[PDB]
């Protein structure tokens, strides 16, 4: 998207979201990142929304195909599951490459650095969902390392109700439960996160209260399913 102005790419990503054209939205935001400037808060959210929708559709398709393949156990179901898997891996590698070149290294404020490290954990987690064997081990460790660095910064630099801090903890708890085979660590992290947020709600405005309590309810929903 090298010939399109940064501001036009941002504008078009917002239009693509309204039109539910998430592949276009992700391509516009990739173009915007590749202009080389840092991203504002709103721009970071557009990047994350675009890719989460693209990879979310791929993951849902991969799960349908993997289920059909497991039930059947010609080459067609495996071949097509492999096709979708390779496409998913390519999208995850693209996002990880944007984070590595050069969004994380330029992110100095806690809000930006935690946001990008949470993305890095999420996209390694999606790689881990489709990985097997020893590849799976190193990919799992890469997710864990990214989430852990984000957690360490978030606990030092953000209040316990901050929505990015909350969503990081939610997604790291899902990583523990679903990827790392550590359900007790998942439950402990979700409970501690919920309780420490509850105790800080009194400091919030009405609108911030709504933002934080929405994520707290997601932590509660997981705790109800896990306990």
């Amino acid at each position: 998207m090298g010939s399109m102005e940064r501001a036009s790419l941002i504008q078009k990503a917002k239009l693509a979201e309204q039109a539910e054209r998430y592949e276009d939205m992700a391509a516009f935001m990739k173009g915007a990142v590749e202009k080389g400037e840092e991203l504002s808060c709103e721009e970071r959210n557009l990047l994350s929304v675009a890719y989460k929708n693209v990879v979310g559709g791929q993951r849902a398709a991969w799960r349908v195909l993997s289920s059909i393949e497991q039930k059947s156990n010609g080459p067609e179901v495996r071949e097509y599951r492999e096709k979708v898997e390779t496409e998913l891996q390519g999208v995850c590698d693209t996002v990880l490459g944007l984070l590595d070149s050069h969004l994380i290294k330029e992110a100095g404020d806690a809000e930006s650095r935690v946001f990008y490290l949470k993305m890095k954990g999420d996209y390694y987690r999606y790689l881990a969902e489709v990985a097997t064997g020893d590849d799976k081990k190193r990919i799992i460790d890469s997710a864990r390392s990214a989430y852990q660095e984000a957690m360490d910064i978030s606990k030092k630099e953000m209040p316990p109700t901050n929505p990015i801090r909350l969503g990081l903890a939610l997604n790291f708890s899902v990583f523990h439960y679903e990827i790392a085979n550590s359900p007790e660590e998942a439950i402990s992290l979700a409970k501690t996160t919920f309780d420490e947020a509850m105790a800080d709600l009194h400091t919030l405005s009405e609108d911030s209260y709504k933002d934080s309590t929405l994520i707290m309810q997601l932590l509660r929903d997981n705790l109800t399913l896990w306990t």
Partner: peptide
Amino acid sequence: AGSIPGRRS
């Protein structure tokens, strides 16, 4: 288990 849906700006 639900992660952040994260699919709406």
